[PDB]
Design a protein around this ligand. Sequence first.
Ligand SMILES: CCCCCCCCCCCCCC(=O)SCCNC(=O)CCNC(=O)[C@H](O)C(C)(C)COP(=O)(O)OP(=O)(O)OC[C@@H]1O[C@@H](n2cnc3c(N)ncnc32)[C@H](O)[C@@H]1OP(=O)(O)O
Ligand SMILES: Cc1nccn1CCCCc1ccc(CC(=O)N[C@@H](CO)C(=O)N[C@@H](CCCCN)C(=O)NCCC2CCCCC2)cc1
Length: 392
Amino acid sequence: EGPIDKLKTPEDVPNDPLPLISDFEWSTLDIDDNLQLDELYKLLYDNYVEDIDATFRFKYSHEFFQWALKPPGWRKDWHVGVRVKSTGKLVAFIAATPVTFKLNKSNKVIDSVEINFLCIHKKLRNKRLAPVLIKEITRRVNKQNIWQALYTGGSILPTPLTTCRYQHRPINWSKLHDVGFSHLPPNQTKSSMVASYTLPNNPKLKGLRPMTGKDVSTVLSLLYKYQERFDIVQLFTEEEFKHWMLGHDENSDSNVVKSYVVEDENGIITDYFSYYLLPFTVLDNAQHDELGIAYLFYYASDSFEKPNYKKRLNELITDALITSKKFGVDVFNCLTCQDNTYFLKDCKFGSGDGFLNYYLFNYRTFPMDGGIDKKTKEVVEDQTSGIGVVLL
Ligand SMILES: CCCCCCCCCCCCCC(=O)SCCNC(=O)CCNC(=O)[C@H](O)C(C)(C)COP(=O)(O)OP(=O)(O)OC[C@@H]1O[C@@H](n2cnc3c(N)ncnc32)[C@H](O)[C@@H]1OP(=O)(O)O
Ligand SMILES: Cc1nccn1CCCCc1ccc(CC(=O)N[C@@H](CO)C(=O)N[C@@H](CCCCN)C(=O)NCCC2CCCCC2)cc1
């Protein structure tokens, strides 16, 4: 005779209404399961980032996902998907990947994460699902005692570190024209343009060779020395840098990241550069269905201290442009970050219509130079940008 439940008081009961029924459920993806990797691939292929005119869409491949989402220390529960209960169809996704960065001006090192691949099926937008995905990944990261994050995005977000502008260097101008990526300037002809962008078919620098596992430690020292010039920079353990520069070195030969080094007579490494391949799907075109694209990644030179710096940097990027032809690259991209403004003009990079904002979650710092004029958004030559990190 009496109550069946244990005593409680108003403090013991939740203060927020219970959640109502949902047609969706959380689903932790396991990308080592090919079928699940296929689902993720499909979701982004049909629903990911497009340019302002809906002409092109980013196309991340299977190999690219395995490289980007599986760096040493990666966590499966940080690959968050959302599924329709009735059919089990994947309709949303977001990911966190470990990263360590340093703010050189205050000499502060932060073990953080990078948030990327936020995507919701086109037919499920404007239902405010995004805020939930963001809060859930935040929950899962905070659970591992990490409270800061680094990510990029469009203008739609408050207080960015800075804003950088995309730059484009045509390799196969004709194809770019054919798909509407570039237009013909007035009083100019298709042949005059092709002739102005033409490059040799073999690299010019002596000592240039593909980077190998033996070069990691030396290339890292070179990058660290070079990186001091920027405000925010990425740090790596030797295995992390190996992963990012060479990929999961199975039989080697990563098809997504390409690394090169320049060693002199004495066998000393004086320069290096890297870039990753991330094509564009051409939405509506009856002659081409894909645009080959390379993005400048991390690079360094020991001549930053000498007066031939700008010249050497231009030669270095020129050889990078030349090597990309071997991989079907139609246009080579980069941002106005790092010391890129030092070579943009002479290597014939043109400004694009896209911008990229950088954000730090839960961490305030002084704003940085984005390589462009704060007012006119135009590129400012030979300007060291505060941004020294590149995201995928
Ligand atoms: C310590 C760890 C912390 C970790 C977390 C750190 C923060 C990470 C933050 C994310 C880093 C992402 C890095 C990348 O991957 S940037 C790439 C983003 N992905 C795409 O652009 C793919 C194509 N678009 C889509 O798939 C959807 O439009 C998305 C999923 C973007 C929005 O879906 P939808 O169109 O259906 O909108 P909604 O009704 O559900 O939600 C409403 C909106 O949600 C907020 N919203 C919209 N777009 C973005 C955006 N680009 N960043 C941040 N917030 C964004 C915004 O506040 C607005 O609410 P409010 O303005 O009215 O208040
Ligand atoms: C990339 C990434 N990873 C993680 C996050 N993000 C950022 C995603 C959110 C921000 C965003 C949205 C969309 C894009 C794609 C985009 O708009 N790219 C532009 C960057 O400029 C572009 O390719 N533009 C082309 C095509 C434009 C077609 C019509 N819209 C262009 O400007 N071409 C001009 C080429 C020409 C310039 C002058 C010299 C000769 C070549 C990038 C980043």
